[PDB]
Swiss-Prot record:
GO terms for molecular function: biliverdin reductase [NAD(P)+] activity; FMN reductase (NADH) activity; FMN reductase (NADPH) activity; peptidyl-cysteine S-nitrosylase activity; riboflavin reductase (NADPH) activity. Changing residue 13 to R: Increased affinity for coenzyme A. Changing residue 110 to A: Abolished NAD(P)H-dependent reductase activity. This is Flavin reductase (NADPH). Keywords: Cytoplasm, NADP, Oxidoreductase, Phosphoprotein, Transferase. Transmembrane segments: none annotated. GO terms for cellular component: cytoplasm; cytosol; extracellular exosome; intracellular membrane-bounded organelle; nucleoplasm; plasma membrane. Monomer. Predominantly expressed in liver and erythrocytes. At lower levels in heart, lung, adrenal gland and cerebrum. Expressed in adult red blood cells. It comes from the Eukaryota. The modification Phosphoserine is found at residues 41, 81. Signal peptide: none annotated. It is found in: Cytoplasm.
Length: 205
């Protein structure tokens, strides 16, 4: 079974809860962070912290070495400008995985990659274009890749009771950050989503 994981984007909205959940669940977690002050003191703590940047191949290589799987929760912290950070980071992650024999990656893009592609809000198009580039990098890597394509990420509690579809239709257009993290982790213990795109959603009310 997967025991050692790297998380990229662990200091982000979804990353922080995914990290806490992963440690509480018993994983040995390594994170790559640019700024360690963004990791919390309270609660569960990663086993290993690498300070560096996903755009630096050597920093990524150090983070991926020795792992059993990789979770990718990279994002732009609501900077909507044109960007290649996520796709360039994914290229570095794939190269490091291949260099170190790691074969499982679970990565978050967005439900816009399942929904009608002509209905992306204009303000989100640049980020979506880079999600599409990152998805291409991961799909073409040949590695076992679960594409997680969530709708709006909310603040609702952890439930573990959300629905996962393969087509972007579902009970709602929201997933709590906690449930999204829970789903990322679920993907580490099953093969059933490898090579698929997945849409987690739930009605919280
Ligand atoms: N907002 C939504 O409703 C929504 C819906 C669907 C999909 N998404 C997508 O879901 C993904 C996760 O979103 P989120 O809101 O959880 O993420 P987020 O809060 O934007 O966090 C982004 C994370 O990526 C890290 N990161 C950015 N650039 C980096 C670099 N050069 N090197 C290393 N780490 C870097 C950030 O580090 P720092 O802490 O150092 O900044 C942070 O940990 C994103 O791709 C987002 O576009 C969002
Ligand atoms: O996350 C928010 O609330 C938010 C707050 C300020 C500015 C934008 C957003 C936002 C998104 C930001 C990024 I970067 C991203 O990548 C994606 I995809 C976003 O998808 C969003 C979606 I779907 C929504 O339905 C709504 I309402 C807002 C967003």
């Amino acid at each position: 079974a997967v025991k050692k994981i790297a998380i990229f984007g662990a200091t982000g909205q979804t990353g922080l809860t995914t990290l806490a959940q992963a440690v509480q669940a018993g994983y040995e977690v390594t994170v790559l962070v640019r700024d360690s002050s963004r990791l919390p003191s309270e609660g569960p703590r990663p086993a290993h912290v690498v300070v560096g940047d996903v755009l630096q191949a050597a920093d990524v290589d150090k983070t991926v070495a020795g792992q059993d799987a990789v979770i990718v929760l990279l994002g732009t912290r609501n900077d909507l400008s044109p960007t290649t950070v996520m796709s360039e980071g994914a290229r570095n992650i794939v190269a490091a995985m291949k260099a170190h024999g790691v074969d499982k990656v679970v990565a978050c893009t967005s439900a816009f990659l399942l929904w009608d592609p002509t209905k992306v809000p204009p303000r989100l198009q640049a980020v979506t274009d880079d999600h599409i580039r990152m998805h291409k990098v991961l799909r073409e890597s040949g590695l076992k890749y679960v594409a997680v394509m969530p709708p709006h990420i909310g603040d609702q509690p952890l439930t573990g009771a959300y629905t996962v579809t393969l087509d972007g239709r579902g009970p709602s257009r929201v997933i709590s950050k906690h449930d999204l993290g829970h789903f990322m982790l679920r993907c580490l213990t099953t093969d059933e989503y490898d090579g698929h795109s997945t849409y987690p959603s739930h009605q919280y009310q």
